[PDB]
Design a protein around this ligand. Structure first.
Ligand SMILES: [Mg+2]
Ligand SMILES: [Mg+2]
Ligand SMILES: [Mg+2]
Ligand SMILES: [Mg+2]
Ligand SMILES: [Mg+2]
Ligand SMILES: [Mg+2]
Ligand SMILES: [Mg+2]
Ligand SMILES: [Mg+2]
Ligand SMILES: [Mg+2]
Ligand SMILES: [Mg+2]
Ligand SMILES: [Mg+2]
Ligand SMILES: [Mg+2]
Ligand SMILES: [Mg+2]
Ligand SMILES: [Mg+2]
Ligand SMILES: [Mg+2]
Ligand SMILES: [Mg+2]
Lengths: 24, 60, 61, 394, 131, 107
RNA sequence: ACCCAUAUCCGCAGCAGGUCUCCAAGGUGAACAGCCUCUGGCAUGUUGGAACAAUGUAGGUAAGGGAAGUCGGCAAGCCGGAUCCGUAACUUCGGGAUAAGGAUUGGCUCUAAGGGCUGGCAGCCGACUUAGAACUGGUGCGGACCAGGGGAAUCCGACUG
RNA sequence: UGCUUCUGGGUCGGGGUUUCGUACGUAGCAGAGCAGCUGCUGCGAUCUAUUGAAAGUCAGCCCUCGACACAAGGGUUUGU
């Protein structure tokens, strides 16, 4: 079987994400 | 037992759909050893498999 | 406790039941149930509706 | 910071272990305090919620806007067949409480009461009180019985009597009687015990305990409604339409820093089936059973002085989800607790009842026996037959 | 002596009832009800025979753009009388009436419910029919 | 005393009450099978195909209110089994279900 | 050969995604819309059974009031087809415009008008429409489906893209 | 909560209650009218009578004691 390649991270944190945003 | 080869071949020999193929439920072991189109033409002639009629869609 | 009659049916209303209705022109109406209230407010005729008392006096039943 | 606009709180924390009742039958948590100036009597009775109807009556309270006017009043009917007294029990006053001292049962206890002592009466050999009753047909057992009553004359302070409902008379499915201790409040304890020893294996009807225009306490278990949310169980505000994870919720539980959720915060759970005691229920009418005399029975329960019609309080098609009330009953102003067929403890009032409204006398003008299984519109059967005329099935 | 029993009151703040007298008004916009302590998130509501603060929303221009005290006379929300009848009208209505109870107009069109007319004698004197 | 045939009418309407629209003809079949298990203590209940057509005659939603059913206990044929007897459940066409007692039909 | 796509391709997989064409019935209807059916196909989308708690998710319904809710009419609802009227400010004179606002609508039984071929007439033939009238129903009729909420202004960008 | 005192529940049927609103079939010198034959006969929505009829109604409505079978069982534990 094809060993699954490591989890494909596609960012959400950072400045785009409006959920968990701190102060600033 | 397994009558999908005979229903497919009966559909192709009758020139209809297998919606209309009527394989006899009592003579399952006589249809089950047909396995060709020549044997199935004999089963058509004997009347063990029948083209079912068109479902009525009346225009009346 | 004057038992009153339905303005639509003609049935005899008892002191707990029904719902009394007053228009702006005067003419307070009593009803036995919202069957008769809904039949009245739809401007149906009691003489054309089979189970009412007025139909059954009109058609001699 | 503080809550901006102050508001009262949703729910009462006096009723707060909002669980299913551990009892099906309402316990008298407190009997009335006796004085020996009164004669000996019962202070409680055990009836069954039959159903509901209207009443029409004149009101005589001076000063009101409804003085000498005819109101309608919702009433409950509680079917109360007479209870049978099968035991006495005395209570000694202790510094730890009020301990049950000695229980003395009767000789002949019916199978109705015997059902109660058995979780499965089909499988059993029905052996209860079979060695107890050998005390009642000898000499030595009767001497021990007399010594038990004499030992209760000295030491008992509270005497309660064991009575069960005569369950055979009801329209219910069950055959198993409800037992209940009723505190005998009356004169001295010896007179009380002689009185209750007289009443052993005897019928006690409801007119013995209660009377008309009496305010009683009605004890029972609430109609059960299930596992309900905090908008049903506690009646908080529904959150706006735009809320993500649901809106029939309590949004903020508590603050950060008491880092527990408090007991005063409203959570979801068991709504209904709670034990309640709801007081000041006026007995509008004590009714009478059906009874046969001069061959033909007399059943006119809902007959009043202004009606003079031979109808019983049973509506057309009977009571809905209950059955027929062929026994004597009490008719109580307003609604009482519980579902239909619910055993419903009646208690004489703890309080010294002195008001204008609570001392009012009652003369009814009209007991409504219209059908409650739909919008009924005829009071009795022959009225319907005289109005409708003859049908096809005739 | 005898006081008003509570009945079902289905005219909250925001209702435009019509004006059943000859002041010249046509509408009455209820801006509050007189006598309400209140509770968090409730509209003050008014039934028959409730003194109410209104606003003529159309009518004579001498009457518009100010607050009038008013009395509610007919309501379409059904209310139970103490003899056990549920009564409701063909529309909601009211009259402009000062703070002591005197009618600003002369006559009242339509019936006046008696829950109002027992409690307000000048309206009952101008009332054509009652209930 | 074992092989008994007998007529029943089953009030399907009070056994099908409350169930959703896509589950009325299947539940009607399940309560006919429970009925045949109750009146005759045979766990092997075989219900006829003409009764299947009779229950499904309208659709999966609308099922007939009463149905007349001939309920026949029988001695079991070979394929010998834990069940000594089987109940065959047959359909009886009936114009009206009025004053129909449970008739013990005779063999 | 075969699959040619809610399982044969590409999406780490029998993945609700993606991926170029050809054929194309009956009714209703303007319709290759939606809804029902025939030919052909299928087995409910990687499982079943029992109950019908809360919280959901997706549909609805609500007396009386009617935006008082909210940052904000968000969401929902109103309106909706056809025919007959009627249609404003303003304007680049094209529009605005289905402006706005009204009436009608079913079934049944009739009447009138609208044509061809052969030898101002006579015979023999066939199509769908349109208009009007009577009668009739518990005022119900675009009965499901389909199917514009509208008006008065202000800012910005002419517009279509 | 119920599970043999010929008793007990259950099923079905019958009554009561109630919900909608007057079934099919038949009949009609009732029917806007139309067609055909020398007044009769067909087509026709609707109406009237039969007929407060028809249909549903405990599945969590109320009484039956009318039919019909069933029910004196199976299992696991528990001792001062
Ligand atoms: Mg504060
Ligand atoms: Mg959101
Ligand atoms: Mg009721
Ligand atoms: Mg608020
Ligand atoms: Mg090829
Ligand atoms: Mg798949
Ligand atoms: Mg579809
Ligand atoms: Mg599915
Ligand atoms: Mg499947
Ligand atoms: Mg509303
Ligand atoms: Mg409304
Ligand atoms: Mg606002
Ligand atoms: Mg929107
Ligand atoms: Mg415009
Ligand atoms: Mg400007
Ligand atoms: Mg642009």
């Amino acid at each position: 079987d094809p060993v699954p390649y490591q989890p494909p991270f596609l960012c959400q944190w950072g400045r785009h994400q409006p959920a968990w945003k701190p102060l600033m | 037992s397994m009558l999908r080869l005979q229903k497919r071949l009966a559909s192709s020999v009758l020139r209809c759909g297998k919606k209309k193929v009527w394989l006899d439920p009592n003579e399952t072991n006589e249809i089950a050893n047909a396995n060709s189109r020549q044997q199935i033409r004999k089963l058509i002639k004997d009347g063990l498999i029948i083209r079912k009629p068109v479902t009525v869609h009346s225009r009346a | 406790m004057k038992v009153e009659l339905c303005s639509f049916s003609g049935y005899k209303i008892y002191p707990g039941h029904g719902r009394r209705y007053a228009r702006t022109d005067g003419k307070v109406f009593q009803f036995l149930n919202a069957k008769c209230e809904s039949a009245f407010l739809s401007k149906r005729n009691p003489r054309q509706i089979n189970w009412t008392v007025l139909y059954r006096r009109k058609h001699k039943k | 910071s503080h809550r901006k606009f102050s508001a009262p709180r949703h729910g009462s924390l006096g009723f707060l272990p909002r669980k299913r009742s551990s009892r099906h039958r309402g316990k008298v948590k407190s009997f009335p305090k006796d004085d020996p100036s009164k004669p000996v009597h019962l202070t409680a009775f055990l009836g069954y919620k039959a159903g509901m109807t209207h009443i029409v009556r004149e009101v005589d309270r001076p000063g009101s806007k409804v003085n000498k006017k005819e109101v309608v009043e919702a009433v409950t009917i509680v079917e109360t067949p007479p209870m049978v007294v099968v035991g006495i029990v005395g209570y000694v006053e202790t510094p730890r409480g009020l301990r049950t001292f000695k229980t003395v049962f009767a000789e002949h206890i019916s199978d109705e009461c015997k059902r109660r002592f058995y979780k499965n009466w089909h499988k059993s050999k029905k052996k209860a009180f079979t060695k107890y009753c050998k005390k009642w047909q000898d000499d030595a057992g009767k001497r021990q019985l007399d010594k038990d009553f004499s030992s209760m004359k000295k030491y008992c302070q509270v005497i309660r009597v064991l009575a069960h409902t005569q369950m055979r008379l009801l329209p219910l499915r069950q055959k198993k009687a409800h037992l209940m201790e009723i505190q005998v409040n009356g004169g001295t304890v010896a007179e009380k015990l002689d009185w209750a020893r007289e009443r052993l294996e005897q019928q006690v009807p409801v007119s013995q305990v209660f009377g008309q225009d009496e305010m009683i306490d009605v004890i029972g278990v609430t109609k059960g409604k299930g596992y309900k949310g905090v908008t049903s169980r506690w009646h908080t505000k529904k959150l706006p339409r735009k809320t993500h994870r649901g809106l029939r919720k309590v949004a903020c539980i508590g603050a950060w820093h008491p880092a527990r959720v408090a007991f005063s915060v409203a959570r979801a759970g068991q709504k209904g089936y709670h034990h309640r005691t709801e007081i000041n229920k006026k007995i509008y009418k004590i009714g009478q059973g059906y009874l046969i005399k001069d061959g033909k029975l007399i059943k006119n329960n809902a007959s009043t002085d202004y009606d003079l019609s031979d109808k019983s309080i049973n509506p057309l098609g009977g009571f809905v989800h209950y059955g027929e009330v062929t026994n004597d009953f009490v008719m109580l102003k307003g609604c009482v607790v519980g579902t239909k067929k619910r055993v419903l403890t009646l208690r004489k009032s703890l309080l010294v009842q002195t008001k204008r409204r609570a001392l009012e006398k009652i003369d009814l003008k009209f007991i409504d026996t219209t059908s409650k299984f739909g919008h009924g519109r005829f009071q009795t059967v022959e009225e319907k037959k005289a109005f409708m005329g003859p049908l096809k099935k005739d | 002596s005898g006081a008003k029993f509570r009945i079902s009151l289905g005219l909250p703040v925001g209702a435009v009832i019509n004006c059943a007298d000859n002041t010249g008004a046509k509408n009455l916009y209820i801006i509050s009800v007189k006598g309400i302590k209140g509770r968090l998130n409730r509209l003050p509501a008014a039934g028959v025979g409730d003194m109410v603060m209104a606003t003529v929303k159309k009518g004579k221009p001498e009457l518009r753009k100010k607050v009038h005290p008013a009395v509610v006379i007919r309501q379409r929300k059904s209310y139970r009388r103490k003899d056990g009848v549920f009564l409701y009208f063909e529309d909601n209505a009211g009259v402009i009436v000062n703070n002591k109870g005197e009618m600003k107009g002369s006559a009242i069109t339509g019936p006046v419910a008696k829950e109002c007319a027992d409690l307000w004698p000048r309206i009952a004197s101008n009332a054509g029919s009652i209930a | 005393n074992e092989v008994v045939t007998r007529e029943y009418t089953i009030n399907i309407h009070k056994r099908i009450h409350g169930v959703g629209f896509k589950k009325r003809a299947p539940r009607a079949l399940k309560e006919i099978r429970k009925f045949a298990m109750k009146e005759m203590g045979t766990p092997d209940v075989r219900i006829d195909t003409r009764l299947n057509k009779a229950v499904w005659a309208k659709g999966i939603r609308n099922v007939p209110y009463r149905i007349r059913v001939r309920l026949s206990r029988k001695r079991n044929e070979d394929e010998d089994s834990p069940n000594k007897l089987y109940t065959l459940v047959t359909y009886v066409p009936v114009t009206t279900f009025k004053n129909l007692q449970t008739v013990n039909v005779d063999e």
